[PDB]
Design a protein around this ligand. Sequence first.
Ligand SMILES: O=C(c1ccc2nccnc2c1)N1CCCCC1
Ligand SMILES: N[C@@H](CCC(=O)O)C(=O)O
Ligand SMILES: N[C@@H](CCC(=O)O)C(=O)O
Ligand SMILES: [Cl-]
Ligand SMILES: [Cl-]
Ligand SMILES: [Cl-]
Lengths: 263, 263
Amino acid sequence: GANKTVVVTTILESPYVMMKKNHEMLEGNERYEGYCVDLAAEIAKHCGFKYKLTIVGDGKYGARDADTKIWNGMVGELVYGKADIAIAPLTITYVREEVIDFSKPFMSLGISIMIKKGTPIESAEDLSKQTEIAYGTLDSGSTKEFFRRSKIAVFDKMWTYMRSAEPSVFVRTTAEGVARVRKSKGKYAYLLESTMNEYIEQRKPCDTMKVGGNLDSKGYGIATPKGSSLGNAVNLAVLKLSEQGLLDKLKNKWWYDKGECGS
Amino acid sequence: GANKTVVVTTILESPYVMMKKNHEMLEGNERYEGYCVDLAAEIAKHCGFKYKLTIVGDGKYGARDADTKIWNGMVGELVYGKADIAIAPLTITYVREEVIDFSKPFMSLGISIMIKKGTPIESAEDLSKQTEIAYGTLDSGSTKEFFRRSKIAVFDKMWTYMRSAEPSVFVRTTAEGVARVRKSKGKYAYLLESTMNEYIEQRKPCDTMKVGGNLDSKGYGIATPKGSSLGNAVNLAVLKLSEQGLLDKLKNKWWYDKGECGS
Ligand SMILES: O=C(c1ccc2nccnc2c1)N1CCCCC1
Ligand SMILES: N[C@@H](CCC(=O)O)C(=O)O
Ligand SMILES: N[C@@H](CCC(=O)O)C(=O)O
Ligand SMILES: [Cl-]
Ligand SMILES: [Cl-]
Ligand SMILES: [Cl-]
């Protein structure tokens, strides 16, 4: 049929998608700025489509409910036909690959530890062997699933603690995790992706840091409904942008070029 | 060969695929050891196929001739139907993705610089600004194509030099590039992927070093002929092995430091 506007599901997650300063008098795609906003424009240019950025309604990345088997978040939007493509920091995982298509990765990451500066913690092993400093992850994402599924002793130990910690150590958004680290006087550490960790490390008041090596190694991919015709072109577009150095340029632009914690 | 036996094309490249000690009295798959030999075993178990490891006939990764437009190397073997799958440190690139299928990446890497210890070079920029120290890359691989295509000033400058350098600065195998660094008294530097650079840096005679950051960021993938029925299962197997931590285990195993260099 005739060309239709492509519905892009994404998520309000800095610096991937953020509200522009004058958003209150702006409409459509103009309300937003960020790494994934720039990336969406580049993909659309290369693939020759018009698009509408839509923030995922439940504000989640995507998990499948164990009982109802229903997918939420951006994955749900794709699975249930509410969106045509997801352009966001969406982790390529086994369970998601079974239900949606992913491009080759546009960005690499690993789960990492965020602490308030001066917290006596250097590693996951350190966290697991003490009880004074609480720690948790984002809900409905690939990091929580990592711990839940791990058969590695240290990560299994951390999961056993986290899953039953009171009050809850899990947060609904990254911003909530960041606030908890910053306000807890060193008594909360946050488990999140190195990409987000490194970004926050560059934001005022410069009181957090990434500590230790990454716990794993993986990638974000652009997602489409399983068997979507858009998938092949989008995948080539990612590889082309990668090889032109444009992904490197976008990362530097949004993470470091206007970092607030110095040069 | 036997029916239902998958023909695996691969390449002799340490520590991905190497000849075992006493291999001349060994037979079939038992002749070889290495990261990709182990990976092939795990992939085949997860997908339920028997397989035959074969070393690519021309010893090349794969490039398309500009005039004939014939593909050589492991890419050629998939393209012309001589192999069913490639399991090797084969870089996922735009031009290859157009002609073969790739799994999501099983290993990350970037182009990097290898010098003989003490060589006064700290970066690609340094290399481009001088003429005393020659430098080159592997023939018929993604590193050579990277420089050939780059619009980035420094890399553009390096390509202009390398393409006309005499005697040739290009080598047929990584081993020869390494030997050339070692024997050239600091007058040759070698551009190669960070994975191989780091392996060599830990091996005797401990006389080479990686300098500077990686020049790019990419991934190795398992490749199959376009539209091969093996593709989907192999891709899910890579993601499963990734999430179980088995790829990390294999990396630690074959990049294991016995302390040939220092403590
Ligand atoms: O997906 C990746 C990966 C690999 C290379 C990348 N290069 C650029 C951007 N993103 C990348 C992601 N992984 C790392 C190695 C083990 C499997 C996960
Ligand atoms: N990128 C993750 C969200 C962040 C996290 O889980 O830490 C996902 O796709 O689920
Ligand atoms: N990994 C490369 C070979 C090594 C190199 O080009 O430096 C390829 O797949 O072509
Ligand atoms: Cl429309
Ligand atoms: Cl298993
Ligand atoms: Cl010329």
